[PDB]
Amino acid sequence: KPFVIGIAGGTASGKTTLAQALARTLGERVALLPMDHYYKDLGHLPLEERLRVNYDHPDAFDLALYLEHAQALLRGLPVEMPVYDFRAYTRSPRRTPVRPAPVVILEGILVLYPKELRDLMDLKVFVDADADERFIRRLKRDVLERGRSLEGVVAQYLEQVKPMHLHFVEPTKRYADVIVPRGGQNPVALEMLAAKALA
Amino acid sequence: PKPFVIGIAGGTASGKTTLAQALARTLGERVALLPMDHYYKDLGHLPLEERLRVNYDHPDAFDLALYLEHAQALLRGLPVEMPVYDFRAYTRSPRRTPVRPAPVVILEGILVLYPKELRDLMDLKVFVDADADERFIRRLKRDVLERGRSLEGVVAQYLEQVKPMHLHFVEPTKRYADVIVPRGGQNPVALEMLAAKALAR
Numbered sequence A: 001k002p003f004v005i006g007i008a009g010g011t012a013s014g015k016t017t018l019a020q021a022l023a024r025t026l027g028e029r030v031a032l033l034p035m036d037h038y039y040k041d042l043g044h045l046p047l048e049e050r051l052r053v054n055y056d057h058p059d060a061f062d063l064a065l066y067l068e069h070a071q072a073l074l075r076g077l078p079v080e081m082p083v084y085d086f087r088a089y090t091r092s093p094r095r096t097p098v099r100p101a102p103v104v105i106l107e108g109i110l111v112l113y114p115k116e117l118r119d120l121m122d123l124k125v126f127v128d129a130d131a132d133e134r135f136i137r138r139l140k141r142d143v144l145e146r147g148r149s150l151e152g153v154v155a156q157y158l159e160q161v162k163p164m165h166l167h168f169v170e171p172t173k174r175y176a177d178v179i180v181p182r183g184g185q186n187p188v189a190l191e192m193l194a195a196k197a198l199a
Numbered sequence B: 001p002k003p004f005v006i007g008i009a010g011g012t013a014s015g016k017t018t019l020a021q022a023l024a025r026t027l028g029e030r031v032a033l034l035p036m037d038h039y040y041k042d043l044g045h046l047p048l049e050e051r052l053r054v055n056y057d058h059p060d061a062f063d064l065a066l067y068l069e070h071a072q073a074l075l076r077g078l079p080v081e082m083p084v085y086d087f088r089a090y091t092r093s094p095r096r097t098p099v100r101p102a103p104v105v106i107l108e109g110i111l112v113l114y115p116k117e118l119r120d121l122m123d124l125k126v127f128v129d130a131d132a133d134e135r136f137i138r139r140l141k142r143d144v145l146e147r148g149r150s151l152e153g154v155v156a157q158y159l160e161q162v163k164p165m166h167l168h169f170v171e172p173t174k175r176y177a178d179v180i181v182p183r184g185g186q187n188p189v190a191l192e193m194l195a196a197k198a199l200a201r
Helices: A015-029 A063-074 A131-145 A150-175 A187-197 B016-030 B048-052 B064-074 B132-145 B151-176 B188-198
Strands: A003-009 A030-034 A079-085 A090-098 A103-107 A123-128 A178-181 B004-010 B031-035 B080-086 B091-099 B104-108 B124-129 B179-182
Touching: A003 A015, A003 A150, A003 A187, A015 A030, A015 A103, A015 A123, A015 A187, A030 A063, A030 A079, A030 A090, A063 A079, A063 A103, A123 A150, A123 A187, A123 B188, A131 A150, A178 A187, A178 B188, A187 B179, A187 B188, B004 B016, B004 B151, B004 B188, B016 B031, B016 B104, B016 B124, B016 B188, B031 B064, B031 B091, B064 B080, B064 B104, B124 B151, B124 B188, B132 B151, B179 B188
Parallel strands: A003 A103, A003 A123, A030 A103, A123 A178, B004 B104, B004 B124, B031 B104, B124 B179
Antiparallel strands: A079 A090, A178 B179, B080 B091
């Protein structure tokens, strides 16, 4: 019976801001599950790998765990969402609690990739943005805010992000019920999504 | 009381028409529908031959001023005399059809999101997206099966007239939309969301 909204789109497409805004509009009546909070725990491998891994490939995601959490929230059961130790680039043993709610938001680049996930959604959304605009947003954030080097941002985008978006993320757009452009700055679409939820 | 104005664009046979009509159906007498394809310029001053060569997908074929005029009228709860196209003479006939005002107005058509003046009148800008191959197929099946056209005729007309206009004029307007609707002819979720958003008033 809880309302399930899946929100997909490219990295830095504004899908995150869109989901975060949707949640804040509904307050404690929601349960947001960020797929990026579900990378495969690779503590066993050295820090040689990890960071060297393609975090945009489906195999990098602990799909099984995500689905389970999605299913629990659906059956009114609270989950222990995984906290990521970005200090060592491995899943932190710390667990952030997610109280079940009448409306559930599943957002992430591959939230529309698996059928078992799509079937759980009452509403499917794809945040669309052009590659150049998505690259620019990620750029401005990493270089201007996070102090990353220009060169590094370019390389990581080209060898890791772009090939994954084209091969896995982009095709999932045809499964969406609604496609939202300018996901980070689109009051109308936000309103439409919230109103449907409040039903 | 504004009222609520929705722009609905998309390519030919993208299902934009199907979506608008179905949305208006849910809203009943509470909605005023103005398809821009009822606003092609009057070409009586042109000999029949010249009217046959006009590309009806070029924005120059549309009577923008008259459309913008009627849109502004309905925004004031004022009814309008929407024109009717005659297929016998390939031109706008003198006969009109009254469109009564309503709390929600739907401006639909190819290029409905093309002019700035029109977009400024819209509270919600929707673009119905569909791949060109599918748009061709849909239009193809409609013309051969329901209009008795040959496959060669539809292709030539599609290649020399429709495709270039869609690429140069229609496709670019997708960037102005607030929401993109795929599979416009069969999307109850999007249709419900549009219905419920209009029912907000």
